[PDB]
Structure formats: C-alpha cells, structure tokens
Design a protein around this ligand. Structure first.
Ligand SMILES: [Mg+2]
Ligand SMILES: [Mg+2]
Ligand SMILES: [Mg+2]
Ligand SMILES: [Mg+2]
Ligand SMILES: [Mg+2]
Ligand SMILES: [Mg+2]
Ligand SMILES: [Mg+2]
Ligand SMILES: [Mg+2]
Ligand SMILES: [Mg+2]
Lengths: 114, 88, 95, 56, 274
RNA sequence: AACUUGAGUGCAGAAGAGGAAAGUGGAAUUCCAUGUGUAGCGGUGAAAUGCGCAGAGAUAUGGAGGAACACCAGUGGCGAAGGCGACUUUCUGGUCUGUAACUGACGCUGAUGUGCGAAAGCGUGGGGAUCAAACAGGAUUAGAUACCCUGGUAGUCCACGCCGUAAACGAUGAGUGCUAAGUGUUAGGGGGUGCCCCUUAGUGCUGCAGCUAACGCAUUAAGCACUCCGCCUGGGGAGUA
RNA sequence: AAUGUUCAAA
C-alpha cells in the first residue's frame, strides 16, 4: 500500500470510469459517475469528470503516490478534464499514455443505427 | 508446364530442318505437350476453374491448325497423327 | 535451381553444447540431396522487437541451400515445428 | 537509385516505418511506387521474424 | 467412399452399403484366429440380463495387441483386412524378427516402416510411442489409461483425442466426446487418426441387415399391458402420464445424472460434456 | 502459284490482391481459471427489461476456441465476367513491351449445345467467436406486428453436390480501319543530361470538329464506314395462365 | 439523435 500507482481510466459515452492501482492491478479505490448520482446523460460530462478524478484520487488514504501515469481507455468526451482535474488532489502527473484497443479487422461490428 | 529446354527437346524433333520453328507441324507438338502438361494438373485440382479455360482455349487453336493442314496434303496429316497420338 | 534460404531462432534457455548440436543436426537434414551451405551464420543473440513465448531473446541462424528437386527443405518444415527448440522459422525462395 | 531489399536488412526499413509502428504513405515519403511495393512485401516478412515491431 | 444401390426391389429402395475399396483381402491367416462362442446376453446363470441380442452371423475373434512391446524394432504393413468384431479396420504387420501380429489401422497407409515404443522415433502416421514424448497439438488414438494395460480410449472408427498440454506428472488430454481428462504421463498412445471414416454413413435399409449383425428387435414401452413396463396399457393409445419417462425397472430415464458419487476419478475430471 | 502488312510460333527482358493445395504469425471480441476490490455496470431523446454482494463492470496474469487480415492502399494493378488485399512454399493460366528468325491468311462473328457464374436458399457432413431473419422482454405512439434497447435460433465458416437468378450497370454487344489539342497516372522500350523529349499498351479529367430531343459523348465516341449475331413495336392485363 | 395522421366531387 506504499506510494505507487498507475491510472486506468476509460470514458465511453456512459459513466467514465476512473480506477487507480499500484504497479500490479490491485484496486485501491475505483470511482465512477454512478457512485455520485448522475443518471440523465450527465453520466458523461466534463463536470462528471470533475468529480471523477477527485473522488478516486483523494480516496488514496494508504498510498497518496508520487505520480499517476494515466492509461487512457475509452475514446469519449471526458478525456482531458479527468487528467487536469486529477492534479487537483496533488499527485504530480508527469507522463501520459493512450491505449484504446484498435482491431485489425477481427470481428464484424454491430449494425448501423437509424 | 513445359520448360524452355524440354520444349527444345520436343520442337526440333518434328519440324523439317528449316533452323527456324513456328511451323504448322511443330505447333501441334508443343500444344499437346502443354495439354498433357496441364491435363495431369487438372486431375488433382478438380476445384480449380481459372486454369481450365486456358486449357480449353489452346485446345481450340490446336483444332484450328489440325483443320488447316487438310488443304495442302493429307499425307502430312495421316502419319502426323500416327506419330503424335491424337484421336480421329 | 531454386535458392532456398531458411533462417530460424533457437531458444535462449539452453546450454551451449546443445546450441552447437542443433546447428549440426539441421545442417545434416539439409544435407540430404544438396546442402550447398555457403553460410551457417550465427548472427547472434539480440532482443527481438517484441515478445514470444515469455522469451525476450533468441538465437538466429541463417542458412543458404541450393537444390533442384526441392524435397529437402520440407523435411525441415515438418521436423522443425514438432520440436520446441525453434520458436519461429522461415523458408523463402529466391532465383 | 538503390538496389533491391531483403528482410536481412536490419535498419534500412526502420527509417520508413513511422515512430509508432506503421508504414508511411508514398505521399508522405516521396519515393516511387514500385519501391514501396518492395517495402510492403519486405517489412511484413520483417515483422514475421520480429526484427521490426508491431506497435510501440 | 460409399456406393449406393439402385432401387429395384421395395426393401432395397434406399439401402446404401459400405463399399470396400482399400481392402487388400488376404484370407485371414491361421495363426491368430481364436474361437469365439456367441452368447446372447445371458450370464453365468442363464437368464437374460441385457435385452436385444441374439443370433447374428458366426463371428471369429482375431487377437490383436495393444500393450505394444518391441521397442526399436520395425514393422512392415502388408495388408488391410476386414474385421467383424469392431468397427475400425485392422492391419497386419510383420516384425524384422519375423513375428506376425495385428494392429488397428490408422488413416493413411498401405506399406511402410512403423516402429513401436519409439521414444526416439519420428511422429509419422501410425507410429506409436509413450505419452510425454508427444508435442502439444497432435491427434492420437489408442490411449492407455493405467500404464501397461492395453488402450481403452479412442479405438472406434474414426475417433481421435488430442493433447492440450502438460502438467509434469499428468497431461490434459481432451477426448472425443468433449470431456477433458487427466491421464498418467507414461502411457503408450498410437499417433494418428483411426481409419474407415464413412462407417456411420451407411443406411442399412432392410430389416435383415440389423438382424444379421445380431440385434434382435426391441419393443416400445406404451404397448405392453401394465405389469411389464411402467408405461402400461391404456385404452387406445395413451400419453405417458407419469411425470417423467421411465425405464422398465422403474428408474427415470430422461435427464438424470448417474455416476457413483466419488469413485476416485473426479479429481481427474476437469471439464465434462456440454 | 507466290508475297506479306492480318493473326500465330521463336528470342530477350518487364511487371501482377489471376487461381488451386498445405504451413506460420500479430491486433481484437467472447467465454472459462485466480489475484485486488465494492456498489453498480450496461442502456438511450429520456427510461426500463437484462447482469450484480452468493463478490459484478473497471484490471493483473493465463488458458481455450473461431472469424477477418488495421498501417501500406492510391480515379493503383489483375481477370472474359462474378470478383480477388497478412506472410512463405508447391503446381498452373493469361496479357504487355522490344526484336525481327520462321509459318504464309492459318482470321472475324456465332443460331442450337457446351461451360464459369455475387448474396440468399436446399441435401449429407463437420464447425460455432462476433454478428444476426423468426421470435421473446422493455420503452414510443391512440394502436406499432416497426425504426430504439437487452437477449437470441437458422444462417454467416470449410469440404463435397445442387440451384443458375440481381440496378450480373459504363443501365452503352463483338471485331477492324480513320478525323484538333491539353492534362494527370501505371507497366515498359529507345534518344540526349539522379533530370529534358519520341512512340506502344492500358486508365482519369478538360476540351473543338461532328452527331444529339436535350442533358451531354467526344482517339477508352453516343463521330465517320463495313461484317455477323441478340432484342423491341403504346401502357395496364403480364414476365402471370 | 424525434413525436407529429388526414383534406368529400371534376
Ligand atoms: Mg394389448
Ligand atoms: Mg407399474
Ligand atoms: Mg383416447
Ligand atoms: Mg398410462
Ligand atoms: Mg447448409
Ligand atoms: Mg436487435
Ligand atoms: Mg458488379
Ligand atoms: Mg466511362
Ligand atoms: Mg401491348
């Protein structure tokens, strides 16, 4: 529980998830818009990101680590307002990563909406 | 199919000694060599179809040239069939 | 009449006498009907650019084989897969 | 004018992959057409023997 | 392949026999035929235990081996011969010592050198060697279960299990029916896929060609008057009424898992049928 | 009888997702295994059905299994057409350029037959990962059998065998000659100094002459000539009896 | 990214 952390966030169009962990994948304190009472498509605002990175980041209480090293899953509208506002708990962002799973034409997508 | 020199092992052995091929008696030999070159291949690939019209087209031209040599003398045609075995 | 180049990797976690044993057997497999081995090159251990089989390193070997009847290298292509000292391999023709 | 390219060439292809791990287009690089056909049949069998990576 | 019969007679109309193409029929040679009496499903007392057996054609048991001895000693496959006992074909080999014995036939072979117990022997078709020497991914018939006995697994016409991987004292081999079972690491296991592939494509058509095999006709439940079968006689035809279908000896027969609790193999079963 | 321009055969080289048969690899989806963790994930215009403390989704490792091959990739190439795009090997068709050594009109078109022929469908087999008719559940409206969402069977996948249709479309049959010019591009071949102009073959645009009802086509003709075949004769009724 | 039907007789 001692002073480390990698940041795994995703942001689809619904309920941008923030979950910070250690060098392994062990689940310090996950956080969502859904733990906060956002349901009517305020599940994903940049204001929903404004209370996303805060209530996971400030809920360290065992590590309070030195850097965060974000890994950006989920191409969606809550990206950079969850990484600027991650700094508001005082954690010293210094290098960012963007990992969204790009297929190589594996499985055919679901059909087009109308 | 036939290689270069194997074609050379079949071209010189039919035509008259003109030292220049492309005769109405040497083209039949290399065409039949190309047929039974490829017609053994179509035994093991009975799924293939783009190879088969290349077979059938040159069978067409062979039936043209063996129905051109009629108009000159049949004595070329008769023993020319008797050596390089075709039907009819 | 067909310049078969083969090249293959050997697992890093062996002992060196077995490493110079595999280069002796597989250049005898190619020695059946024309070896023509102009280079048995131990172009050595590097870090290959990604990871395979939890092995970060590998032992390359570059072999040139010339032949006509082209039966020979398919013995290698059968027998190299079934073993597990060779994580990847290639044969490639050139004329 | 540079001669033909095999996948034993360790680094000659690396100047023509992007920094991330993808090919450059002919529009971006500015070579001929045939040369980059030799690139696209060269660098893929480079990837098959792991001399050049997929994704950084 | 199979050959089919032109409908000339109203029994023959749809019957399709197996056509014997690869057979190289010698008269089955004298030194291995062992005399087999029929027995029609009546045990040592004399009363009928399992039903539906009876007078087939008079068969003759051909002793084949499975506990393959003779390490490092070769064999030539002479001829493929028909067998009436089992469903796969059989094959005769001749050792270089000069001994004759049968083995069951893999998919493709007509002559050649195959060796047995070949711990250093290349894994071609029909080649047979102990189990931990096999690389992962191949197919395999004729598998032992306890070492040195003679295989009980994948001997039928066409079936072949395959190795998923290893443990160190066991492996994880997955069978034909979909189970995944650990077996002990030192077991003979003949490589390949056992032959005679179109055996279930036959369509025997006549009533007699099940009666020649030795299968007497059954009789359904809901025709018997109700002291012989629980779907007893009703007025007319009758729905089965009782809240499941049942066996003649009063057990449920439609979806009731029956294996004896523990019996010292459940720690080996990894994944059952699906 | 001969000749050689039409078409063929030789010689050199040049390309190409043309096909058929084995083999190898990477990204991704899903479902199993176990770590950490706890109150929701997912969902739309908004919401619910569905999954969740018995331990979800987010994440760490690992396994299994099938499908398609991001970047290159482009009015780019190849095939008669449908079409074909990871990589290597085995077999094999076709066209282009230059060259003049032969053969000396051997050619064109094709009535009936003979064959190839997307996608769905059918038969006996296997395979089943994502999708996904019928259907089932929740909203929407007055009702909604629909568009929306959560699931899901056939099928989509491979071998063998049928069916033989489509906006199978440049809505433009096939062959051969002839009449301004610019302008890209692909595969070559010669001339003069990595660059500058000569012609052949395809393939895009802009454009006179000419035809055209007009839109527009215009050296890849819908222009000017010939040769052969297929087809129409007002729309409904009808591609039906 | 909508929830919106119809207009008796030439
Ligand atoms: Mg009765
Ligand atoms: Mg009773
Ligand atoms: Mg009744
Ligand atoms: Mg009853
Ligand atoms: Mg089907
Ligand atoms: Mg749906
Ligand atoms: Mg089309
Ligand atoms: Mg056009
Ligand atoms: Mg009419």
């Amino acid at each position: 529980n001692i002073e480390n952390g990698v940041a795994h966030i995703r942001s689809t169009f619904n309920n941008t998830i923030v979950t910070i962990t250690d060098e392994f994948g062990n689940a310090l304190s996950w956080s969502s818009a859904g733990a906060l009472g956002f349901k009517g498509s305020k599940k994903s605002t940049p204001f929903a990101a404004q209370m996303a990175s805060e209530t996971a980041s400030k809920s360290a209480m065992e590590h309070g680590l030195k850097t965060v090293e974000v890994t950006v899953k989920g191409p969606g509208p809550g990206r950079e307002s969850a990484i600027r506002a991650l700094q508001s708990a005082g954690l010293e962002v210094t290098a960012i990563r963007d990992v969204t799973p790009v297929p190589h034409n594996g499985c055919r997508p679901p059909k087009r909406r109308r | 199919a036939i290689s270069q020199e194997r074609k050379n092992e079949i071209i010189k052995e039919y035509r008259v000694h003109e030292t220049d091929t492309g005769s109405p008696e040497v083209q039949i030999a290399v065409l039949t060599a190309e047929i039974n070159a490829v017609n053994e291949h179509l035994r093991t690939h009975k799924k293939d179809h783009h190879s088969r019209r290349g077979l059938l087209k040159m069978v067409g031209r062979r039936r043209h040239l063996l129905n051109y040599l009629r108009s000159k003398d049949i004595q070329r045609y008769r023993e020319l069939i008797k050596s390089l075995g075709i039907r009819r | 009449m067909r310049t078969y180049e083969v090249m293959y990797i050997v697992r890093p976690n062996i002992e060196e006498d077995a490493k110079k044993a595999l280069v002796e057997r597989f250049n005898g497999i190619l020695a059946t009907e024309g070896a023509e081995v102009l280079e048995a090159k131990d172009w050595g251990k590097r870090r290959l650019a990604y990871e395979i089989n939890d092995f970060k390193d590998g032992f390359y070997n570059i072999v040139r084989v010339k032949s006509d009847n082209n039966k020979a290298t398919d013995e290698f292509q059968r027998l190299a897969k079934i073993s597990d000292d060779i994580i990847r391999y290639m044969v490639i023709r050139e004329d | 004018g540079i001669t033909h390219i095999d996948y034993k060439d360790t680094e000659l292809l690396k100047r023509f992959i992007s920094e991330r791990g993808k090919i450059l287009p002919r529009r971006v690089t500015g070579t001929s057409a045939k040369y980059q056909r030799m690139l696209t049949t060269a660098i893929k069998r480079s990837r098959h023997m792991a001399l050049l990576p997929y994704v950084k | 392949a199979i050959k089919k019969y032109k409908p000339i007679t109203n029994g023959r109309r749809n019957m399709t026999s197996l056509d014997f193409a690869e057979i190289t029929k010698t008269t089955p040679e004298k030194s291995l035929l062992k005399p087999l009496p029929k027995k029609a499903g009546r045990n040592n007392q004399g009363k009928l235990t399992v039903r539906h057996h009876g007078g087939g054609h008079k068969r003759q048991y051909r002793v084949i081996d499975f506990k393959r001895n003779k390490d490092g000693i070769n064999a030539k496959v002479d001829s493929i011969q028909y067998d009436p006992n089992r469903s796969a074909n059989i094959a005769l080999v001749v050792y270089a010592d000069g001994e004759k014995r049968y083995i069951i036939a893999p998919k493709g072979l007509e002559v050649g050198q195959i060796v047995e117990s070949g711990a250093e022997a290349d894994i071609k078709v029909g080649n047979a060697l102990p189990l931990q020497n096999i690389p992962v991914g191949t197919v395999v018939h004729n598998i032992e279960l306890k070492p040195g006995k003679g295989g009980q697994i994948a001997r039928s016409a066409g079936a072949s299990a395959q190795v998923l991987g290893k443990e160190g004292k066991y492996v994880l081999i997955r069978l034909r029916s979909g189970e995944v079972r650990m077996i002990l690491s030192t077991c003979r296991a003949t490589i390949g896929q056992v032959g005679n592939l179109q055996h279930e494509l036959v369509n025997v058509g006549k009533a007699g060609r099940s009666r020649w095999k030795g299968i007497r006709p059954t009789v359904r439940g809901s025709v018997m008057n109700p002291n012989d079968h629980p779907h007893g006689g009703g007025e007319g035809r009758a729905p089965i009424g009782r809240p499941s279908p049942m066996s003649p000896w009063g057990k449920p027969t439609l979806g009731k898992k029956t294996r004896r609790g523990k019996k010292s193999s459940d720690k080996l079963i990894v994944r059952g049928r699906k």
